[PDB]
Amino acid sequence: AQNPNCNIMIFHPTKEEFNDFDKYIAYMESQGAHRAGLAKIIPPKEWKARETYDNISEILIATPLQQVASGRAGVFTQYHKKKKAMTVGEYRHLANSKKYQTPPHQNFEDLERKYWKNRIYNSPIYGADISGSLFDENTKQWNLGHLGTIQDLLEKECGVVIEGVNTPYLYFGMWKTTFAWHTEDMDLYSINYLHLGEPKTWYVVPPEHGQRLERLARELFPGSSRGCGAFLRHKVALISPTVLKENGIPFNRITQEAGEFMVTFPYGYHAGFNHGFNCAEAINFATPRWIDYGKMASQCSCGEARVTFSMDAFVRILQPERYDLWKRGQ
């Protein structure tokens, strides 16, 4: 078996290898990459996502979200408070202000220490789930707006045509903005490209051990667990690496820098934080190997995690017994 310790693998495709997206994901899996839950892909030196980022300041962030924490430093939840609209240029200036800017630090380890020590005491603002793309139309390789759609994958694999679409999203981050522990909707894959700015640190549990994280989360967030059998789908819970280690949860960590892709694999729980002002683009995707994960994916039906109407068909087709109850959630 490849990659038995479930380490995060890093890939360096050549420009020839970067032509066929699906073929390369399959190659990474052949080497055991999915066992970690997460992989890093560094693009060939000849590739570029777009010519410059000099003209992105007028993009609007319609609903910036202030991420307010409750709990303790290593075990906390966050809720999102809506703020007034601001442009990307306005947001950048805010992220760089004295109130929000990254503190002085020695290296990524020292900043990680400061994140986990002090996160709960601040409420950073972030731009999320902004439909759009910053890839140039003429970037032909690994353009996140041009990948096979999940609908088309389901049709190709299972024979039925369904409604829905699958487009990318933009994320604007600042120091301490946080992504809570979760898997993707329907336990899909994700791909994430860090366009511009400061890094993003990631934490990931191997898919084979996801239920260990779930069990710990039910112990650490008992009221939430009583409220919903799939509360992690609410995307509000954080557990620090120190608490994970104390509890024996297998995980790994890695820092993504601008110009790098990260791929999350089905049922790979992940969480993380931004080092400073940055912009990422992400989209969910499927492969044939996903179908079995989508059939088994847990669902939130308490109401709290509402999602894409594109997800309706996936539940309807892959999980017909659950459909009725889930549809009520939405």
Ligand X SMILES: Cn1nn[nH+]c1CC(=O)N[NH3+]
What residues form the annotated binding site for 2-oxoglutarate? 126, 192, 200, 235
Which of Ni ion, ligand X, Zn ion, none sits in contact with 300, Cβ below 5 to 8 A by type? Zn ion
Comparing CB distances to ligand X, the nearer of 240 and 325 is 240
Q: Is 145 in the site for Ni ion (CB under 5 A)?
A: yes
> Measured between alpha carbons, how far is residue 181 from residues 54, 82, 107, 210, 241 in Å?
33, 21, 24, 11, 12
| CA 245/CA 272 separation, integer angstroms | 16
Instruction: Choose the binding region for ligand X from 39-47, 184-192, 203-211, 298-306 (rule: CB under 6 A).
Output: 184-192
φ, ψ at 144 (rounded to 5°)? -65, -10
Contact between 190 and ligand X (CB under 6 A)?
A: yes
Pairing of strands 261-264, 38-41: antiparallel
The yes or no reply on residue 40 touching ligand X (CB under 6 A) is: no
Does position 270 interact with ligand X (CB under 6 A)? The reply is yes
- Could you say which of 192, 224, 274, 287 contacts ligand X (CB under 6 A)? 192
Cβ of residue 280: shortest distance to ligand X, in angstroms?
A: 4
The one of Ni ion, Zn ion, ligand X, none whose footprint includes residue 260, by CB under 5 to 8 A per kind, is: none
Site for ligand X in 152-181 (CB under 6 A): 171, 179
Q: Does 73 bind Zn ion (CB under 5 A)?
A: no
Tokens (6 digits) for 320: 């017909």
Decide if residue 258 touches Zn ion (CB under 5 A). no
The minimum distance between CB 126 and ligand X, in angstroms, equals 10
Instruction: Select from Ni ion, ligand X, Zn ion, none the partner in contact with residue 228, using the beta carbon and a kind-dependent cut-off of 5 to 8 Å.
Output: Zn ion
| By the rule CB under 5 A, 148 interacts with Ni ion | no
CB of 55 to Ni ion, least distance (A): 17
The least CB distance from residue 328 to ligand X, in Å, is 26
The residue of the chain with the least Cβ separation from ligand X equals: 192
225 binds Zn ion (CB under 5 A): no
> Which residues sit in the known binding site for Zn(2+)?
228, 234, 300, 302
Of residues 277-316, which lie at the interface with Zn ion (CB under 5 A)? 300, 302, 304
Compute how many residues bind ligand X; rule: CB under 6 A: 9
- Give yes or no for residue 228 binding Zn ion (CB under 5 A): yes
Measured from the CB atom, the residue of 77 and 183 that comes closer to Ni ion is 183
Q: Give yes or no for residue 264 binding ligand X (CB under 6 A).
A: yes
Find the shortest distance in angstroms from Cβ 326 to Zn ion.
10
3-state secondary structure the chain: CCCCCCCCEEECCCCCCCCCHHHHHHHHHHCCHHHHCEEEECCCCCCCCCCCCCCCCCCEECCCEEEEEEECCCEEEEEEEECCCEEHHHHHHHHCCCCCCCCCCCCHHHHHHHHHHHHHHCCCEEEEEEECCCCCCCCCCCCCCCCCCHHHHHHHHHCCCCCCCCCCEEEEECCCCEEEEECCHHHCEEEEEEEEECCEEEEEECHHHHHHHHHHHHHHCHHHHHHCCCHHHHCCEEECHHHHHHCCCCCEEEEECCCCEEEECCCCEEEEEECCCEEEEEEEECCCCHHHHHHHCCCCCCCCCCCCHHHHHHHHHHCHHHHHHHHHHC
- The residue ranges that bind Zn ion (CB under 5 A) are 228, 300, 302, 304
- The residue ranges that bind ligand X (CB under 6 A) are 171, 179, 184, 190, 192, 264, 270, 280, 282
